[PDB]
Amino acid sequence: SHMTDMWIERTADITWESDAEITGSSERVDVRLDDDGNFQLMNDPGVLWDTSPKEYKKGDTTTGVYRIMTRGLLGSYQAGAGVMVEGVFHTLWHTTKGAALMSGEGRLDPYWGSVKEDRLCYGGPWKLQHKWNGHDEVQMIVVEPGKNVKNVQTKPGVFKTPEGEIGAVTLDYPTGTSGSPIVDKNGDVIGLYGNGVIMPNGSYISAIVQGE
Ligand SMILES: N=C(N)N[C@H]1CC[C@H](CNC(=O)[C@H](CCCCN)NC(=O)[C@H](CCCCN)NC(=O)Cc2ccc(Cl)c(Cl)c2)CC1
Ligand SMILES: [Cl-]
Ligand code: NI
C-alpha cells in the first residue's frame, strides 16, 4: 500500500576497491553555481519537509549503494543512484526531483533537499559529513545503468568558485549514474557524482557534490 512511480534497489557495498582502474585527470577551472543548480564557466556556451501518522511502512534503509528505478513508456530504466548511510538515503536532487521512493515492504519520503546544490535525502537529515581531503585520490562507485557496479579511481581536480574550492572529477557517465557515491581510502562517502560542467574542449567534469 506504499507505491510510487519510483523505487530503489540495493546493488553494492560502500567500499574502497584496490584493484580499481585508474583514470580521469586533474583540472583547475573557474566556475559559479547559479541559483538553478547549474555550474557555469567564465563565459559559457533549500527547504525541509513536514512529512505525521503515515498510511504505509517506512522503507528499508539498509546501508549500501543503490540504483534508483522507474518505468517509462518502453518499460523500466535507472533514473539515478544513491547511498544509504546511517539510515538516510542520499542522492542528487535531479534524479528524483523529490519523488517518493519504494524500498522493500515500505516507502521513503524526502526529508531535506536543495535545488541549488542538487542534493536530496530521504527519511532523516543529511548523514554524509566526510569530505574530500584536498589532495588524495578518490574512488567513484560507478553505478552505471545496465552495467555491473565498478570502482574507478581518479585524482580530483578543482572547481574554483567565489564560495571557495570544490573537488571535481573528470569522469563521463550516463545520466542514470547520477547520485553515485564517491569514497575516500577509509570508505567514507565524500560526495556524490553527477552535477558539473562541460569544458570548452568537450570534457565533462563533475563536482564532488557534498554538504557545506
Ligand atoms: N554531458 C556529458 N558529457 N555527460 C553526462 C551528462 C549527464 C550527467 C548527469 N547530470 C545531469 O544531467 C546534470 C543536471 C544538472 C541539474 C542541476 N541541478 N547536468 C550536468 O551536470 C551538466 C551541466 C549543465 C550545463 C552547464 N551549465 N549538463 C550536461 O552535461 C548536459 C547534458 C548533456 C547530455 C545529457 Cl544526456 C544530459 Cl541528460 C545533460 C552526467 C554526465
Ligand atoms: Cl556497506
Ligand atoms: Ni596526505
From Swiss-Prot:
Chain spans, region Interacts with and activates NS3 protease: 8-45
Domain of life of the native organism: Viruses
Domain Peptidase S7 positions: 46-212
Signal peptide segment: none
Topology Cytoplasmic: residue spans: 4-45
Active-site residues annotated for this sequence: H94 (charge relay system), D118 (charge relay system), S178 (charge relay system)
Membership in a protein family: In the N-terminal section; belongs to the class I-like SAM-binding methyltransferase superfamily. mRNA cap 0-1 NS5-type methyltransferase family.
Protein name as annotated: Genome polyprotein
